[PDB]
Design a protein around this ligand. Structure first.
Ligand SMILES: *[C@@H]1O[C@H](CO)[C@@H](O[C@@H]2O[C@H](CO)[C@@H](O[C@@H]3O[C@H](CO)[C@@H](O)[C@H](O[C@H]4O[C@H](CO)[C@@H](O)[C@H](O)[C@@H]4O)[C@@H]3O)[C@H](O)[C@H]2NC(C)=O)[C@H](O)[C@H]1NC(C)=O
Ligand SMILES: *[C@@H]1O[C@H](CO)[C@@H](O[C@@H]2O[C@H](CO)[C@@H](O[C@@H]3O[C@H](CO)[C@@H](O)[C@H](O[C@H]4O[C@H](CO)[C@@H](O)[C@H](O)[C@@H]4O)[C@@H]3O)[C@H](O)[C@H]2NC(C)=O)[C@H](O)[C@H]1NC(C)=O
Ligand SMILES: *[C@@H]1O[C@H](CO)[C@@H](O[C@@H]2O[C@H](CO)[C@@H](O)[C@H](O)[C@H]2NC(C)=O)[C@H](O)[C@H]1NC(C)=O
Ligand SMILES: *[C@@H]1O[C@H](CO)[C@@H](O[C@@H]2O[C@H](CO)[C@@H](O)[C@H](O)[C@H]2NC(C)=O)[C@H](O)[C@H]1NC(C)=O
Ligand SMILES: *[C@@H]1O[C@H](CO)[C@@H](O[C@@H]2O[C@H](CO)[C@@H](O)[C@H](O)[C@H]2NC(C)=O)[C@H](O)[C@H]1NC(C)=O
Ligand SMILES: *[C@@H]1O[C@H](CO)[C@@H](O[C@@H]2O[C@H](CO)[C@@H](O)[C@H](O)[C@H]2NC(C)=O)[C@H](O)[C@H]1NC(C)=O
Ligand SMILES: *[C@@H]1O[C@H](CO)[C@@H](O[C@@H]2O[C@H](CO)[C@@H](O)[C@H](O)[C@H]2NC(C)=O)[C@H](O)[C@H]1NC(C)=O
Ligand SMILES: *[C@@H]1O[C@H](CO)[C@@H](O[C@@H]2O[C@H](CO)[C@@H](O)[C@H](O)[C@H]2NC(C)=O)[C@H](O)[C@H]1NC(C)=O
Ligand SMILES: *[C@@H]1O[C@H](CO)[C@@H](O)[C@H](O)[C@H]1NC(C)=O
Ligand SMILES: *[C@@H]1O[C@H](CO)[C@@H](O)[C@H](O)[C@H]1NC(C)=O
Ligand SMILES: *[C@@H]1O[C@H](CO)[C@@H](O)[C@H](O)[C@H]1NC(C)=O
Ligand SMILES: *[C@@H]1O[C@H](CO)[C@@H](O)[C@H](O)[C@H]1NC(C)=O
Ligand SMILES: *[C@@H]1O[C@H](CO)[C@@H](O)[C@H](O)[C@H]1NC(C)=O
Ligand SMILES: *[C@@H]1O[C@H](CO)[C@@H](O)[C@H](O)[C@H]1NC(C)=O
Ligand SMILES: N[C@@H](CCC(=O)O)C(=O)O
Ligand SMILES: N[C@@H](CCC(=O)O)C(=O)O
Ligand SMILES: N[C@@H](CC(=O)O)C(=O)O
Ligand SMILES: N[C@@H](CC(=O)O)C(=O)O
Ligand SMILES: [Ca+2]
Ligand SMILES: [Ca+2]
Ligand SMILES: [Cl-]
Ligand SMILES: [Cl-]
Ligand SMILES: [Zn+2]
Ligand SMILES: [Zn+2]
Ligand SMILES: [Zn+2]
Ligand SMILES: [Zn+2]
Lengths: 691, 691
């Protein structure tokens, strides 16, 4: 038989291991020749594997690189202007790679150039609340200071935005052992911890879903009109650079001014974690100087796009997509994901060679430049937006398959919950102590749902990966799944470091490649069901259940201000009414879905299921974020990695007691309630009888 | 048989006559009780006629009415402040209607209140070019003047916008005999001409597709959040009032200052048509004073929505829609259209009673508040946008069926050209001298295509009627057809006057109701084909042909500035490339459409045809006009009634030699070329093989 079991059984841990090794021997930085060569290799193999067509789709997008002959670094400078301490020019390369060329040194992609000199202020994680605590409670002024922040908790682009708005003249990002060194585990290469010389690379843009900073709305094709740099989307206005904890300790140890306000501000280094500004008495005349000479340049990038044409509904697309570009070797990020995609393609191709095709078309993508702002997936979706609009069933992401070895981690639309519960019940758990048990059992035991007793936890989709354009801009049902640790937004210790290698994975994360195999079964299984099930495997009732939970939650936030709700007549009745109607109508649609040989009614009904995620899109977008159009979900305005529910109302209520004109502020809360109630009702009505 | 011939044969001139009489005995002004009663009558009869469901969809929208106890008028005032001449408080009512109550006096809907006093300047038609001629050539300054303009040539809202931007402190609109009095025909009631006391009503908004000024983007439902009046969309900032030519003559006769610049500025009254400012010597101290006390108020409006469920594709919608609200009796506008819709419903219902259903669902609409800004159609489409998005096959408009008795007038998407040529070849001409000939023959003879030798003329869709939201915002293939005169944007003489009655139509326009019947056959026939043809009756090749014509035209406009095109490297090569590709791909799609028993391929192909108009929508909209999203067509920025092709490039090039920063201006031309080439290519690719 050619069924899901046939598909699943053909996947091999040994193949994923071979592919990972193959993808991680040299760096594959976006816009470099080596990453163009890997793209051509993948294109060739996907053809070999049996796909109907495999093309490269290229774009010319803004990237950012250090200057090879003028290196980035930070100094402590004395009053004579002598640089008495300098941060490292590169990470000590790992054993056996000390002669690899073209390892990009640590840098913050898209930093402007500058050489600012000033006094340090330590801002903890540089979160919105950390800056509130500094300015409002401690009365510390960041204007014209160099801010030093530890990595972790939120997307680093939000840190930089926050520092900029606090008036900082530069930002130093560092990895604190508190966040990147697990107690009792050894540093790379003897364990999976971050050494003192390790540094996390990463872009610091605030693109809000725009894609290439120069071409928002349109693909960066060969005739594209580009904004000038001054009008580019999402570039930081102050220099930024990351460092490791050996260098950070040297910068923090001399810090004076005010004590940290509490223990949540102290990391694990042997320093007081004084907030500053500036150094204690003896060193009060010393300053910190940054030297940043990185350049932004328009650079060609290449996506590989593989097609397996559907036998029955070739105009319905199930997409499996993940990126290929890496900061250095990409041992976990992304090649642990890409190796799984490669094996999934191989298995689907094996079935195809025996005469099978999926019912719907499957598209497979190897995205470029994800590390520089989701650029490859976003440009391709801008180019193909009308096709995706009208034909996109689902998008399944495929970055890193592992970030730990503890249990499954799934983020997806409520429309895919039942598909995921059902599939994981049919898969074997790879976990020690659960041999003979289902993945559903071990996942549910290790990651219990807090909201829904007895179920495993499934999180909201945020952003910070390639599903963003498909889900938040276009409204195509999306999901992702990976193995994870027991710090959820911080990354694993070696994240975006030179030390993230094949050996890291083979020695410390997944020696038998059983977690990679489990994740290939989950991702590949989801794609298989989505592409082959006669009725799309979406349960609208799961959306009704979460909508009620999110409505309760947003109402509860507003109800912290009962006087204002009274004064301005702020009612959530419309939103609860719309959610009630969505519940009722979804329940009736489910009955019809059970109760209909008629392919028009079937496809009519499958169209209603497909367009249900689409119904949550508002073509006007969210306030000042035109590329975030989903009304139920958006990346949090304070942390791109986290999803926020009813984001328009949430941002309207955020810090509302601080707004100078409460009448206007509460008016805008009421506007967002109306938009949310309307969109929920309109989405519900897509499920009503069509005539 | 139940075929188109059965449908067509059931339509009766005698029925349309009875319905017109029924719809025109009392005024049906939007937001009044009488128009709510007509809505309920129509709802009842559509049910009686056999539709599956008929509902009222209501909205609470901003309307505008004169103050019943404080009437609008204009004076000439002497230096003592004595009002020595006053304009009329009402039109002399027509014979037999002198005791009808609730005839709204002439007024400009949505004028603000005010009593401005000042000197007159005569601005011809108040077109963009008339103001260029005044300010640039004649050096006349409208700042703080009261402008008097004749009606005609462009939408009156554009006149008012133009006067406002010229700094006028008020606008007087009048009907000149040159534009509203046909030589050798008698005044109402003895002929169809405008009497000296007649006045054209009409709104003066600049909504740019927004709908209700208070709720742009969202339906004005019972929980809607409304903008405050200061932030409302499209309201004029200066008072405006219309008058007839007896009153206009009194205002113009004393005008001094400069002579008219040429004969195109002179109407037919016995006055010099001096441009002013102010009156000649003896009267130099006299001034004009307006008194406007109209109020804007949120008022309930009601659409009637009738459904005839499709037998095979109930989730595909063909819409026949036209308005019901009128300024006074609506003898032509709209009830000549509504009476035709009513008979079309009756005929479709007759077939339904015998067991027939159309293949696709037909929706029938009686829109409210069209006269106040397309409010009823626009709110309903905002409410139902997701359904319309994904299911809307076509919209056929149905305002006035006649505006003359000479020949057919058709405006539609190129996708409907072939449908219209084919249908008109199968219909009998109602024209004297063409008995026994087809409507195609008489139409082609009387209205030859200028662009396409041997074909009849088909015009672009502009706006100023209820198809606007469906076509320019949502991208649903649209069309309209009516009988017309041999002045195309000016209106017929009695347009929006009290004199537009049943008797006007029965006595002077269409005594035998044969033109109404021909138009019922064209509109009803188009709906029938669209709702019943197995393959959607759209020919993508006709789009390819017009796209080339529009590309040539826009390139030719740019080529008036060859030095700048050289200096700024302005190339249209991308747009011509995209049009060439669209031509090639459309030709190949047509072949496949000919060459495929498979309903999935059929519906796959019908979806490609349906979504082809949709592919021209840009979700970012046109510059500062977010509700005009179609990239090929938009209402002209200088005349809402006229369609403009490649509007984004056209507006970028318009008056470009006057821009202060040519580098920036030509940059924006290049941007619009890129947007246009991209959208044309993307539309083409919706017709490629889907996988
Ligand atoms: C969830 O679904 C239900 C449908 O089951 C839907 O109920 C609808 O609610 C609206 C608004 O509350 C009702 O609107 C009424 O409609 C009648 C005409 O049918 C009007 O006469 C009413 O207006 C009068 O009363 C108003 C309210 O006090 C006054 O402000 C107004 O000026 C009038 O005097 C009113 O408009 C509608 O009838 C129902 N439909 C039903 C019950 O079938 C509900 O709106 C849906 N929720 C959302 C968020 O969409
Ligand atoms: C209409 O349809 C045709 C397809 O038939 C389509 O042709 C495409 O044109 C583009 C842009 O002109 C071609 O792009 C080239 O692609 C190759 C890789 O395949 C690149 O190597 C080329 O780039 C080099 O040369 C450039 C131009 O001088 C340099 O600027 C650049 O830096 C590189 O050195 C170039 O990108 C594409 O291959 C074709 N596809 C074909 C012929 O099949 C055309 O674009 C369509 N029109 C529109 C408006 O979309
Ligand atoms: C990764 O695997 C690929 C695919 O086998 C290897 O590329 C092949 O290399 C051989 C030997 O040089 C060539 O003959 C083939 O043409 C290549 N096939 C391709 C590119 O599809 C590649 O060398 C491996 N890389 C590493 C680092 O092991
Ligand atoms: C930090 O790096 C800087 C730059 O290389 C070093 O300063 C340079 O030292 C040389 C030789 O002493 C001088 O000729 C240059 O003028 C210096 N450049 C600048 C910008 O100061 C510095 O010595 C290094 N500091 C440490 C402690 O290693
Ligand atoms: C997940 O599995 C459940 C249990 O098998 C599926 O629910 C059943 O679906 C069939 C077919 O429609 C019904 O006859 C049963 O009554 C359902 N049982 C229930 C609801 O308890 C469910 O459809 C699956 N989810 C998917 C496929 O998305
Ligand atoms: C227009 O025609 C309608 C439909 O026949 C007339 O309305 C009917 O009036 C009769 C007699 O008063 C009532 O018994 C019916 O209930 C009405 N039917 C409806 C409203 O569907 C209406 O009077 C006619 N109007 C004019 C001005 O002739
Ligand atoms: C134009 O209309 C105005 C308003 O009705 C007339 O002016 C009024 O005349 C009466 C009696 O003479 C005065 O008591 C009012 O004070 C006047 N009102 C104003 C605002 O002036 C005027 O007479 C009319 N003019 C003509 C020529 O008919
Ligand atoms: C308008 O009528 C023409 C002529 O009958 C239609 O074109 C024919 O369509 C049939 C069916 O596809 C073909 O076999 C003929 O070869 C066509 N003749 C031509 C192109 O000259 C055309 O399809 C009709 N247009 C519609 C229905 O939109
Ligand atoms: C690298 O640095 C030097 C010194 O400023 C500069 O001249 C060279 O052009 C740089 N390379 C760039 C900016 O790409
Ligand atoms: C912080 O310092 C800057 C620059 O000296 C000053 O202009 C600004 O007002 C200060 N902000 C606060 C909140 O005190
Ligand atoms: C793998 O699992 C073991 C057992 O729980 C654990 O001790 C080890 O830390 C894990 N490795 C990683 C990288 O998480
Ligand atoms: C009509 O005019 C009078 C005089 O200003 C005013 O008091 C009354 O309220 C008006 N009606 C309105 C504004 O609706
Ligand atoms: C027209 O008159 C106004 C008001 O007196 C003046 O401010 C303005 O500059 C004038 N415009 C021109 C173009 O002369
Ligand atoms: C009707 O047609 C006749 C014949 O051409 C023409 O003289 C008359 O003006 C027409 N009536 C109207 C209202 O156009
Ligand atoms: N996944 C990359 C890029 C995320 C983004 O740019 O949104 C990172 O977190 O650094
Ligand atoms: N058809 C009406 C309204 C047009 C509009 O508001 O766009 C008129 O021309 O006056
Ligand atoms: N693993 C994180 C961080 C990254 O990919 O860079 C994510 O999914 O976005
Ligand atoms: N007959 C014109 C004017 C109007 O309807 O008011 C139109 O179609 O828009
Ligand atoms: Ca772009
Ligand atoms: Ca609205
Ligand atoms: Cl992922
Ligand atoms: Cl019309
Ligand atoms: Zn990644
Ligand atoms: Zn990454
Ligand atoms: Zn009308
Ligand atoms: Zn009208």
């Amino acid at each position: 038989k050619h069924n899901m079991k046939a598909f699943l059984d053909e996947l091999k841990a040994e193949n994923i291991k071979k592919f990972l090794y193959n993808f991680t021997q040299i760096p594959h930085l976006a816009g470099t020749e080596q990453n163009f060569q890997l793209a051509k290799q993948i294109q060739s193999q996907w053809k070999e594997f049996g796909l109907d067509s495999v093309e490269l789709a290229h774009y010319d997008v803004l990237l950012s690189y250090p200057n090879k002959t003028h290196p980035n670094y930070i100094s402590i400078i004395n009053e004579d202007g002598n640089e008495i301490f300098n941060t490292s020019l590169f990470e000590p390369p790992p054993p056996g790679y000390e002669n690899v060329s073209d390892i990009v040194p640590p840098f913050s992609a898209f930093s402007p150039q500058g050489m600012p000199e000033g006094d340090l202020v330590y801002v903890n994680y540089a979160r919105t609340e950390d800056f509130f605590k500094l300015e409002r409670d401690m009365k510390i002024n960041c204007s014209g200071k160099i801010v030093i922040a530890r990595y972790g908790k939120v997307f680093r682009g939000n840190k930089v935005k926050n520092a900029q708005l606090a008036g900082a003249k530069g930002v130093i990002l560092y990895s604190d052992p508190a966040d990147y060194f697990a107690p009792g585990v050894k540093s790379y290469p003897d364990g999976w911890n971050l050494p003192g010389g390790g540094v996390q690379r990463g872009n610091i843009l605030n693109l809000n879903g725009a894609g290439d900073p120069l071409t928002p709305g349109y693909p960066a094709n060969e005739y594209a009109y580009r904004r000038g740099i001054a009008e580019a989307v999402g570039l930081p206005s102050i220099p930024v650079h990351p460092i490791g904890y050996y260098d950070a300790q040297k910068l923090l140890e001399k810090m004076g001014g005010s004590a940290p306000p509490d223990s949540s501000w102290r990391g694990s280094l042997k320093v007081p974690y004084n907030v500053g500004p500036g150094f204690t008495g003896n060193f009060s005349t010393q300053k910190v100087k940054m030297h940043i000479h990185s350049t932004n340049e328009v650079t060609r990038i290449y996506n590989v796009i593989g097609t397996l044409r559907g036998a029955v509904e070739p105009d319905r697309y199930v997409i499996l997509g993940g990126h290929r570009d890496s900061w250095v070797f990409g041992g976990i990020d992304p090649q642990s994901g890409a190796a799984v995609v490669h094996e999934i393609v191989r298995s689907f191709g094996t079935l195809k060679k025996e005469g099978w095709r999926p019912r719907r078309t499957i598209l497979f993508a190897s995205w470029d430049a994800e590390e520089f702002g989701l650029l490859g997936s976003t440009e391709w979706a801008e180019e193909n937006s009308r096709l995706l609009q009208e034909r996109g069933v689902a998008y399944i992401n495929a970055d890193s398959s592992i970030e730990g070895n503890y249990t499954l981690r799934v983020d997806c639309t409520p429309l895919m919950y039942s598909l995921v519960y059902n599939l994981t019940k049919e898969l074997k758990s790879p976990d020690e102590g659960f041999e003979g048990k289902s993945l559903y059992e071990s996942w549910t035991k290790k990651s219990p749902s807090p909201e829904f007793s007895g179920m495993p936890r499934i999180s909201k989709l945020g952003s910070g990966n390639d599903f963003e354009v498909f889900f938040q801009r276009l409204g195509i049902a999306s999901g992702r799944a990976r193995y994870t640790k027991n710090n959820k937004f911080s990354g694993y210790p070696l994240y975006h470091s030179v030390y993230e290698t094949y050996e890291l994975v083979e020695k410390f994360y997944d020696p038998m490649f059983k977690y990679h195999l489990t994740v290939a079964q989950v991702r590949g299984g989801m794609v298989f069901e989505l592409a082959n099930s006669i009725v799309l495997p979406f349960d609208c009732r799961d959306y009704a259940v979460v909508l009620r939970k999110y409505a309760d939650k947003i109402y509860s936030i507003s109800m912290k201000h009962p006087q204002e709700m009274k004064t301005y007549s702020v009612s959530f009745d419309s939103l609860f009414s719309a959610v009630k109607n969505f519940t009722e109508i979804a329940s009736k649609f489910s009955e019809r879905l059970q109760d209909f040989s008629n392919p028009i009614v079937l496809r009519m009904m499958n169209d209603q299921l497909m367009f249900l995620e689409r119904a949550f899109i508002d073509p006007l977008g969210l306030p000042d974020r035109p590329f975030y159009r989903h009304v139920i979900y958006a990346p949090s305005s304070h942390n791109k990695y986290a999803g926020e529910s009813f984001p328009g109302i949430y941002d309207a209520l955020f810090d509302i007691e601080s707004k100078v004109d409460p009448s206007k502020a509460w008016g805008e809360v009421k506007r967002q309630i109306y938009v949310a109630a309307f969109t929920v009702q309109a989405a519900a009505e897509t499920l009503s009888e069509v005539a």
